Amino acid sequence: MNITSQMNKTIIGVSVLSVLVVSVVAVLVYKFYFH
């Protein structure tokens, strides 16, 4: 079980990139289909 001891900064970065990306897509379709 991860005890939130330490984490790589690089990991956080990519994580955010995937967050926005995914979100954007969901929105693009939401409008492109249900504008």
From Swiss-Prot:
Highly expressed in placenta, spleen and peripheral blood leukocytes. Detected in monocytes, macrophages, dendritic cells and several types of T-cells. Expressed in pancreatic cancer cells but not in normal pancreatic cells (at protein level). Glycans are attached at residues 2, 8. The chain crosses the membrane at residues 10-30. It is found in: Cell membrane; Early endosome; Cell projection, Ruffle. It comes from the Eukaryota. Induction: By LPS in plasmacytoid dendritic cells. Likewise, mutants lacking two or more of the other N-glycosylation sites were deficient in interaction with LPS. Belongs to the Toll-like receptor family. Belongs to the lipopolysaccharide (LPS) receptor, a multi-protein complex containing at least CD14, LY96 and TLR4. Binding to bacterial LPS leads to homodimerization. Interacts with LY96 via the extracellular domain. Interacts with MYD88. Interacts (via TIR domains) with TIRAP. Interacts with TICAM2. Interacts with NOX4. Interacts with CNPY3. Interacts with HSP90B1. The interaction with both CNPY3 and HSP90B1 is required for proper folding in the endoplasmic reticulum. Interacts with MAP3K21; this interaction leads to negative regulation of TLR4 signaling. Transmembrane receptor that functions as a pattern recognition receptor recognizing pathogen- and damage-associated molecular patterns (PAMPs and DAMPs) to induce innate immune responses via downstream signaling pathways. At the plasma membrane, cooperates with LY96 to mediate the innate immune response to bacterial lipopolysaccharide (LPS). Also involved in LPS-independent inflammatory responses triggered by free fatty acids, such as palmitate, and Ni(2+). Mechanistically, acts via MYD88, TIRAP and TRAF6, leading to NF-kappa-B activation, cytokine secretion and the inflammatory response. The TIR domain mediates interaction with NOX4. Ni(2+) may cross-link the two receptor monomers through specific histidines, triggering the formation of a dimer that structurally resembles that induced by LPS. This process may be the basis for the development of contact allergy to Ni(2+). A mouse model of contact allergy to Ni(2+) in which TLR4-deficient mice expresses human TLR4 has been proposed. This is Toll-like receptor 4. It comes from Homo sapiens. The lineage of its organism: Eukaryota, Metazoa, Chordata, Craniata, Vertebrata. The gene is TLR4. The chain holds residues 623 to 657 of 839 of the full protein.
